Amino acid sequence: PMEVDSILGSLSITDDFDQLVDVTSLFDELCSKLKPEAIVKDPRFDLFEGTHSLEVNNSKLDSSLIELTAEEIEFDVNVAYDPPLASVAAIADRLLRCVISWLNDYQTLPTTVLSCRYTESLLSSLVKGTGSSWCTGNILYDKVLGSCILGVCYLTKFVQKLLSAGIVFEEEDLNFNNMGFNTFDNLPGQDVVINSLTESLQILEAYSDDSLHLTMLKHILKIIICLVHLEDHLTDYSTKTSHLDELIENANSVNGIFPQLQLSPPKGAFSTYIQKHRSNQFPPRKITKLPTDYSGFITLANDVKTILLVDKAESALETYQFAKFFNKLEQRHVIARILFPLFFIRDDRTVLGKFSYTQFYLLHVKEFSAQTPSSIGNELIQESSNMLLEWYQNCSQNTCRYRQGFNRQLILWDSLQAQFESVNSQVYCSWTYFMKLSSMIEFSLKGFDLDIYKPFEAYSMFWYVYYLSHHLETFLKDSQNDIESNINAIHSMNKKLKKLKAGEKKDQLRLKYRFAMDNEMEQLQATKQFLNYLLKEINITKSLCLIEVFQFAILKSFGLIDNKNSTPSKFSNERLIHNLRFKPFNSIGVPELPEYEVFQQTLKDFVIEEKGAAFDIKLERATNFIETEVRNVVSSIDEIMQGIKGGDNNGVLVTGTRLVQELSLEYYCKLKHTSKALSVNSKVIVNTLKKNIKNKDSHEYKVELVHTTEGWNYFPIQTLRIKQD
Amino acid sequence: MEIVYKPLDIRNEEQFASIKKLIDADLSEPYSIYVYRYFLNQWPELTYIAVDNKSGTPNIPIGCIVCKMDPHRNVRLRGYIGMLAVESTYRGHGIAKKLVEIAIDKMQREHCDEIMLETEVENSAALNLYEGMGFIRMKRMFRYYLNEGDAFKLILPLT
Amino acid sequence: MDILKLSDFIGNTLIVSLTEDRILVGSLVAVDAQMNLLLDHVEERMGSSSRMMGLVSVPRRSVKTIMIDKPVLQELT
Ligand SMILES: CC(C)(COP(=O)(O)OP(=O)(O)OC[C@H]1O[C@@H](n2cnc3c(N)ncnc32)[C@H](O)[C@@H]1OP(=O)(O)O)[C@@H](O)C(=O)NCCC(=O)NCCS
Ligand SMILES: [Cl-]
Ligand SMILES: [Cl-]
Ligand SMILES: [Cl-]
Ligand SMILES: [Cl-]
Ligand SMILES: [Cl-]
Ligand SMILES: [Cl-]
Ligand SMILES: [Cl-]
Ligand SMILES: [Cl-]
Incomplete structure (x- = not known):
C-alpha cells in the first residue's frame, strides 16, 4: 500500500520464523493419492466442529472482503x-x-x-x-x-x-x-x-x-x-x-x-x-x-420501573402474582428481564433482603395451606426452596424460553411430590402438587400462544387442559373444605363457651379459643378467600377449554376437521404422533396422562354423528352451551376484576394483585374479549355450514387457530377460511 | 420435464460443487466447504439429488437434500434434515416433496426412530410440506434465524 | 527414509499465503482430497496489520503457497 508502515511491515512478516520451507508441491502430490471421500484429520476431532468455520474469498463469509468507502x-x-x-x-x-x-x-x-x-x-x-x-x-x-x-x-x-x-x-x-x-x-x-x-x-x-x-x-x-x-x-x-x-x-x-x-x-x-x-x-x-426516535428509552425506563415495584411486596402472594403478570402481557426489555431475578434474589442469599430462601418458601406454603408446621435445614425444604426460586426466574425469560422452562420443572415437581409422599409430609406434598398441576396447565396453554399446536391438535390439547383443570378444581375444592372445617372448629368453640358457666373448664376453653382467634383465624380467612379466587380462576380456565372442545366437535360433526393429520402420509402413524405431543406428561403419575383410547372415545361422545332433524337438535344443545357458558365466564371475570379493583381487604376474594393491579385488569379484559369472540365465532360457523350443506357446490374450508388482537391467545379462535387454489 | 432422483456419488467432484452452488443461493448466510464435507463425507448415503433428464442439461442437479443420523440420548436414532433446495425454475412440481420422501424412506430403512429439522416460522411452504407428512412442532426457538424470525423444531416419529 | 504423510502435518502450524497479499498462519485441523484446508487459531497478516480469525477454511484455488517452519518439519519425520 502507499502507506509507509504497510510497506516496511511486509519485510518483517516472516521474521518471527527462523526458517521457512515451501510445501505446496508436496501437499498436492499427497492429496492426489487420497480418495475423493477421504478426509485427513485428527482421529479425536469431530467434523461437526468445522460447521462454524469461515471461508476465505467468499463475500458473505470473509470479513477481509468488506467494501468500504x-x-x-x-x-x-x-x-x-x-x-x-x-x-x-x-x-x-x-x-x-x-x-x-x-x-x-x-x-x-x-x-x-x-x-x-x-x-x-x-x-x-x-x-x-x-x-x-x-x-x-x-x-x-x-x-x-x-x-x-x-x-x-x-x-x-x-x-x-x-x-x-x-x-x-x-x-x-x-x-x-x-x-x-x-x-x-x-x-x-x-x-x-x-x-x-x-x-x-x-x-x-x-x-x-x-x-x-x-x-x-x-x-x-x-x-x-x-x-x-x-x-x-x-x-x-x-x-x-x-x-x-x-x-x-x-x-x-x-x-x-x-x-x-x-x-x-x-x-x-x-x-x-x-x-x-x-x-x-x-x-x-x-x-x-x-430506530428513528428515542421511544426505546421510554420502554426501557418503564420496564425497569415495573421491576422495582416488587420490593414493595408484603406477602408471598404479592410476589407470586407479580411474577405471574409483570412479563405476561408482552415481553419486557431484556435489561429489565435480567434485572428482576438479580433484584429479587440478592447478594446476601436473601429474597428482597427480607427473608431467607427457606423462609420465603414456607411463606408460600403458609398462605396456601394456612398452617404453621410446628426440622431446620431440611433437605426436602431446601430443595423445594431452590425449585421455587427457579420458578420465579423462569417468569423473566423470553416468550419461547418461558414455555421451555416448564419442561424441566414438571418432572422435578413430580419427583419432589413423590419424595414428600414417601415420608408422609402431606402439607408440603399438597403445595407441591398445586404448583406442578398449575405448571402443567400453564405449559400446555402457552403452546397455543406460540402457535405450537396445529388446528387438528386443538381438541387433544384443550380437552387435556380441561381434564387437568378438573383435577385442580377438585383438589382446590377439598383444600377449601378442609379450611372451612378448621374455621368452623374455632366457631364451635365459641358456641360451646356460651352454653358453659364460670368454671375451670370454661377457663381452658376460652384460653384455647382466644389462642385460635389470635394466631389462626385471620390466616384461615385469608387462605379461604385466596382459594376462593383460585377456584374462580380455574373454573374460567376449565370453561374456556370446554368451549373450545365443543367448538372442535361441531367442526368435526360437519366434516371440516379431524383429530389427526388430514393429509395421508406413509411414514408415521397417528398413535406415534399423539404420544410424541404428550411426551412431556408421560412420566407424571398424578394426574395420570389419559390413554390414547380415552382421547378417542371422549371425542366420539362430543361429536354429533346423527343426521337431519336429530343432528339439528344436538347441534343446538352444543351452540347454546357455548353461548351460555361464555356469558358465565364473562360474569366470573367481572367478579374477579371487581375484586382486583376493590383490594384484598373486602372479605370475599384475595388476589394479591396490588403490585400488578393495572396489568391483571388488562389481562382479564383481554380474556373477556376472547370469550366474547368465541361465542360470536360459533354463530358464524353454524350459520355458514347449514347454508353450505344445502349447496352441492360447497366451498372447501380449512380451520386455522387465529389470534385475537386484543384477546388472550392461550385460547385462539378456531376460524373457518376458504381454501383457495 | 423428466425428473430423476438418485443418490450422491462422492467420487464426483462436479456433482459436489453443483450441490453447494444450488444450496448456497437460497441461504442468507452460506455454508463453508467443510459444512458440506461434514455431511457428505460422513453420510454419503443420506444425500440425494434431482435431475431433469429431458432438460438441456440432464446431468445437472436442480434439487437436492442433505441429511445425517446420529444416536439421540442413548437409545434412539435421530435422522436430521439439514439442507433442502430446489431450483427456482423447477419449483411447484413436487420435486422437494419427492426428495423428502426418498430421504426419510432411506433413514427409516436405516432404522431411524425419528426425523428432526428446524425451519422458519414464516416458511409456510416448508411447514406445509412437512406437517402434511406427519411432522408436528415440538419447540419454538426465539430469534433462531435472527432478523428473519423464530424457528420451529419439527419431529416426525417413525417408531 | 520414511515418506512424509498428511497425518503428520495435522496439528502443526502452517504458513499459508493467499492469492492477495494476505498471509494466514494457523494450525492445520483437516485436509481433504481436493486440498481444501481447515485451519484453526488463524492469524491473518496483511502488511503492517495483524488480526485473529479463528477457525477458517481455505479452498484449493485460494491457496497461493503452503510453508512450514524447518524445525517442526524435521521433528515430524
Ligand atoms: C420449500 C421448497 C423446497 C419447495 O420447493 P418445491 O420443489 O416446489 O416443493 P413441492 O412442489 O414438492 O411442494 C409440495 C408441498 O409443499 C407445500 N408447498 C410447496 N410450495 C408451497 C407454497 N408457496 N406455499 C405453501 N405450501 C407450499 C405444499 O404443501 C405443497 O403441496 P400442495 O400442492 O398441496 O400445495 C423451496 O421453497 C425451497 O427451495 N426452499 C429452500 C429453503 C427451505 O425452505 N428449507 C427447508 C428447511 S430444512
Ligand atoms: Cl456515519
Ligand atoms: Cl402461594
Ligand atoms: Cl393469604
Ligand atoms: Cl418434611
Ligand atoms: Cl371470624
Ligand atoms: Cl369483592
Ligand atoms: Cl353469520
Ligand atoms: Cl453437473
Whole structure:
C-alpha cells in the first residue's frame, strides 16, 4: 500500500520464523493419492466442529472482503469535522440509537455500539492501561463527545456484568460480541463518569448562542447520565425513580425535536471498519436500519420501573402474582428481564433482603395451606426452596424460553411430590402438587400462544387442559373444605363457651379459643378467600377449554376437521404422533396422562354423528352451551376484576394483585374479549355450514387457530377460511 | 420435464460443487466447504439429488437434500434434515416433496426412530410440506434465524 | 527414509499465503482430497496489520503457497 508502515511491515512478516520451507508441491502430490471421500484429520476431532468455520474469498463469509468507502477507510478521530456542534450532536444521537438497536431490537454489538469509531478508539486505550484517546483541539469533540463515549462504554460494561449472572440466554435475548475487548479495571468508576458528563453539561450551558442542535446535545448528555445510573438498582438495590423519570422526560423532549432539525454525522464515523481489521471470528454483517426516535428509552425506563415495584411486596402472594403478570402481557426489555431475578434474589442469599430462601418458601406454603408446621435445614425444604426460586426466574425469560422452562420443572415437581409422599409430609406434598398441576396447565396453554399446536391438535390439547383443570378444581375444592372445617372448629368453640358457666373448664376453653382467634383465624380467612379466587380462576380456565372442545366437535360433526393429520402420509402413524405431543406428561403419575383410547372415545361422545332433524337438535344443545357458558365466564371475570379493583381487604376474594393491579385488569379484559369472540365465532360457523350443506357446490374450508388482537391467545379462535387454489 | 432422483456419488467432484452452488443461493448466510464435507463425507448415503433428464442439461442437479443420523440420548436414532433446495425454475412440481420422501424412506430403512429439522416460522411452504407428512412442532426457538424470525423444531416419529 | 504423510502435518502450524497479499498462519485441523484446508487459531497478516480469525477454511484455488517452519518439519519425520 502507499502507506509507509504497510510497506516496511511486509519485510518483517516472516521474521518471527527462523526458517521457512515451501510445501505446496508436496501437499498436492499427497492429496492426489487420497480418495475423493477421504478426509485427513485428527482421529479425536469431530467434523461437526468445522460447521462454524469461515471461508476465505467468499463475500458473505470473509470479513477481509468488506467494501468500504474512502470516508470509511480514512476516517480520523483526531480531526474535528465541520460544523462541530451539528456534527458532535449527530454522532451522539446515532450512538444512542445504536444502543437502542442493540438492546431493544436485538442487534449485534459489532454493528451497533462498536460500529462507532470513537468507541473503538476509546476502548483501545483502556485495554493498554489507564483523558480521551483522541485529541482534535476542539472542546466539543475532545471533551463533550469524549464524555459521551465514556458514558456508553460504561453502560456496555454494566450490561456485561448483567449477562455474566446467567439470568437470560446470550445471543438470543442479548448479543455481547465485544470482539475480544477486556478492559480489566482500567475503565473508570461511576463517580468519574458522571462528573465527566456533568463537566460537559456545564460547558454546554456556558455557550451563549442557543441552537436546536445544542438543546438536543444537552438532553443527550442527560440521557447518558441516566443510563449510567441504571446500575444503582443492583449496587444499592435502589427503588428511587428519579433518574428513570428524567430519562423518560429527556427522551420525550428529544422526540419532539427530531422533525424540526436534520442530523448528518461525519461520513465514516459509523461503519463496518472494525469487522474488517479487528480480530473477528464471525462472518461480516451489514448494519441494520436504526430506530428513528428515542421511544426505546421510554420502554426501557418503564420496564425497569415495573421491576422495582416488587420490593414493595408484603406477602408471598404479592410476589407470586407479580411474577405471574409483570412479563405476561408482552415481553419486557431484556435489561429489565435480567434485572428482576438479580433484584429479587440478592447478594446476601436473601429474597428482597427480607427473608431467607427457606423462609420465603414456607411463606408460600403458609398462605396456601394456612398452617404453621410446628426440622431446620431440611433437605426436602431446601430443595423445594431452590425449585421455587427457579420458578420465579423462569417468569423473566423470553416468550419461547418461558414455555421451555416448564419442561424441566414438571418432572422435578413430580419427583419432589413423590419424595414428600414417601415420608408422609402431606402439607408440603399438597403445595407441591398445586404448583406442578398449575405448571402443567400453564405449559400446555402457552403452546397455543406460540402457535405450537396445529388446528387438528386443538381438541387433544384443550380437552387435556380441561381434564387437568378438573383435577385442580377438585383438589382446590377439598383444600377449601378442609379450611372451612378448621374455621368452623374455632366457631364451635365459641358456641360451646356460651352454653358453659364460670368454671375451670370454661377457663381452658376460652384460653384455647382466644389462642385460635389470635394466631389462626385471620390466616384461615385469608387462605379461604385466596382459594376462593383460585377456584374462580380455574373454573374460567376449565370453561374456556370446554368451549373450545365443543367448538372442535361441531367442526368435526360437519366434516371440516379431524383429530389427526388430514393429509395421508406413509411414514408415521397417528398413535406415534399423539404420544410424541404428550411426551412431556408421560412420566407424571398424578394426574395420570389419559390413554390414547380415552382421547378417542371422549371425542366420539362430543361429536354429533346423527343426521337431519336429530343432528339439528344436538347441534343446538352444543351452540347454546357455548353461548351460555361464555356469558358465565364473562360474569366470573367481572367478579374477579371487581375484586382486583376493590383490594384484598373486602372479605370475599384475595388476589394479591396490588403490585400488578393495572396489568391483571388488562389481562382479564383481554380474556373477556376472547370469550366474547368465541361465542360470536360459533354463530358464524353454524350459520355458514347449514347454508353450505344445502349447496352441492360447497366451498372447501380449512380451520386455522387465529389470534385475537386484543384477546388472550392461550385460547385462539378456531376460524373457518376458504381454501383457495 | 423428466425428473430423476438418485443418490450422491462422492467420487464426483462436479456433482459436489453443483450441490453447494444450488444450496448456497437460497441461504442468507452460506455454508463453508467443510459444512458440506461434514455431511457428505460422513453420510454419503443420506444425500440425494434431482435431475431433469429431458432438460438441456440432464446431468445437472436442480434439487437436492442433505441429511445425517446420529444416536439421540442413548437409545434412539435421530435422522436430521439439514439442507433442502430446489431450483427456482423447477419449483411447484413436487420435486422437494419427492426428495423428502426418498430421504426419510432411506433413514427409516436405516432404522431411524425419528426425523428432526428446524425451519422458519414464516416458511409456510416448508411447514406445509412437512406437517402434511406427519411432522408436528415440538419447540419454538426465539430469534433462531435472527432478523428473519423464530424457528420451529419439527419431529416426525417413525417408531 | 520414511515418506512424509498428511497425518503428520495435522496439528502443526502452517504458513499459508493467499492469492492477495494476505498471509494466514494457523494450525492445520483437516485436509481433504481436493486440498481444501481447515485451519484453526488463524492469524491473518496483511502488511503492517495483524488480526485473529479463528477457525477458517481455505479452498484449493485460494491457496497461493503452503510453508512450514524447518524445525517442526524435521521433528515430524
Ligand atoms: C420449500 C421448497 C423446497 C419447495 O420447493 P418445491 O420443489 O416446489 O416443493 P413441492 O412442489 O414438492 O411442494 C409440495 C408441498 O409443499 C407445500 N408447498 C410447496 N410450495 C408451497 C407454497 N408457496 N406455499 C405453501 N405450501 C407450499 C405444499 O404443501 C405443497 O403441496 P400442495 O400442492 O398441496 O400445495 C423451496 O421453497 C425451497 O427451495 N426452499 C429452500 C429453503 C427451505 O425452505 N428449507 C427447508 C428447511 S430444512
Ligand atoms: Cl456515519
Ligand atoms: Cl402461594
Ligand atoms: Cl393469604
Ligand atoms: Cl418434611
Ligand atoms: Cl371470624
Ligand atoms: Cl369483592
Ligand atoms: Cl353469520
Ligand atoms: Cl453437473
